Structure formats: C-alpha cells, structure tokens
Design a protein around this ligand. Sequence first.
Ligand code: NA
Lengths: 17, 17, 124, 122
Amino acid sequence: PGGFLCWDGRSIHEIPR
Amino acid sequence: PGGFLCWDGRSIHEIPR
Amino acid sequence: PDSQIQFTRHASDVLLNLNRLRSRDILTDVVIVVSREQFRAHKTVLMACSGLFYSIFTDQLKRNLSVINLDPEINPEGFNILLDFMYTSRLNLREGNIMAVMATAMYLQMEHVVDTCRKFIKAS
Amino acid sequence: DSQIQFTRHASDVLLNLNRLRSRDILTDVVIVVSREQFRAHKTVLMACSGLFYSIFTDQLKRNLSVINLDPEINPEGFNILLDFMYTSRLNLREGNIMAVMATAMYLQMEHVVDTCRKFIKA
Ligand code: NA
C-alpha cells in the first residue's frame, strides 16, 4: 500500500529581495 | 503584433551522467 | 511591440543539470559532514532549500568555509533523503524513516518538508 | 515506500538563486562583455550554456573568477540570456532578436537559438 504524490505547493523557503 | 509564449520543450542542454 | 517566451520546464532542466554536476563532483564547494559520512554539494542549492544553510553561508565569518559539521544526533540516511530532495524535487519516505526525515528537516529548517511529514503522519 | 514530487520545487530553487544573484551572494565569476561586468554563479552558467560548461570543466580555467567573452558580443544580448538563465523568461524585441540569437549561438544555447529560429519564420 505505497503511493506516489505530485504536489504543487511551495516546497522550500523563499529568499527575500 | 505582440505576444507572450509559454513553451514546454527543453530549454537548455542536458549535462550527461 | 515587445515579446516574451517563458520556458515552463527550464527550472526543472537547470535542477537536473545541477544534480548531474553534483553526481560528477563538479563545482562542489562544500562538504557536509554527518557523523562518519560526507556529502559533497553546492552551497547555493543548500541555501536555496534550507534555512540553516542559508543562515550559515549568509554569515560573513562562515561564508567561505568548505566543511560544515552537523550536530552528531543527525542521522546520515535522513540527511541524504533531504539532499536528494533538494536536487531532485523528490522526497522519498517510508514509515520506518519519516520521523528521522522529519527530525532532520526540522534541524535543517525546511518547514514545508516538516509540514508535509506532519500531514503524512496524520494519514497513517 | 512512498514518494512526493514537488512540482514547483525547481522553479522555487531557481527564484532563490536569482534572489542570491540580485544580492551578490556566493557569486563566484564575473563575465566581462566589452565594458560591462555581470556577476553570476558558475553552476548556473554551466547548467544553461554549452560554452560555460566547457570553460568551467577545463582544468586550466576552473578556478578563474573573471571570464572575458569575445569582444563582438552584445552586452544587452548577454543580459537578456543571463536573465533567462535565472528566470526562464526570454524577453525579445524585433530590434534585438538577431543579437540575442547571435549571443545564444556563441554561448551554445541551441534550444534557445532554435526557439528564435521558429519565431523569425512566424
Ligand atoms: Na573564452
């Protein structure tokens, strides 16, 4: 009962300008 | 006479294994 | 008028190429020591994905250090899972290592990964 | 076993590399194009360009921190392609597409060259 997920949410921090 | 294109083909060389 | 072309798989192609460079040991500029194991990598990618590395290499006193020694409580397999994730976008999890992955992600300050681990645990 | 693929991860990483470049953080090479200097990350240049890949894999040139391009190369054209490398966005005018194409040809960015080639037809 394994799975593979494609997920489009943010994955990592954003480095500021 | 002006356009914005989203293109999903490869953009750059592939560095080999 | 003006014109623009957005290459939608460009970022993914760059990341693949950065991984290829890592696998061949090309332009790697730091070794991460995790107990007895060593992981060669690019500072820029580590910074891009991890709060801890970002802080470490934003520090003037530690910018140009080429060896980073992690806390000895960190397990190497968990760090490797997260290193692979940084360079591939792929987070591999088993039920037997998710606490180790989660714990490592918390230490590295990768909060989005920490939260994904949280949600997996709720779906056990 | 389980696997999660984060589909905007690469795009987020690239944005963060561009943010680092905009703040001059861990930039490690200066590209000289006539009178202009461009600071960048060797790793991003190698990833996007056949020529930089060749330059920075060369044992004699790996540890150099300034690269002088051919003096025929346009600074505006190089800038357009450098922006593209770090953003995925190629900004073109009809006035500079030939310069961009030419610069792309010189940098051995063949997929970019071919994209310009298709537009010139259309
Ligand atoms: Na040259």
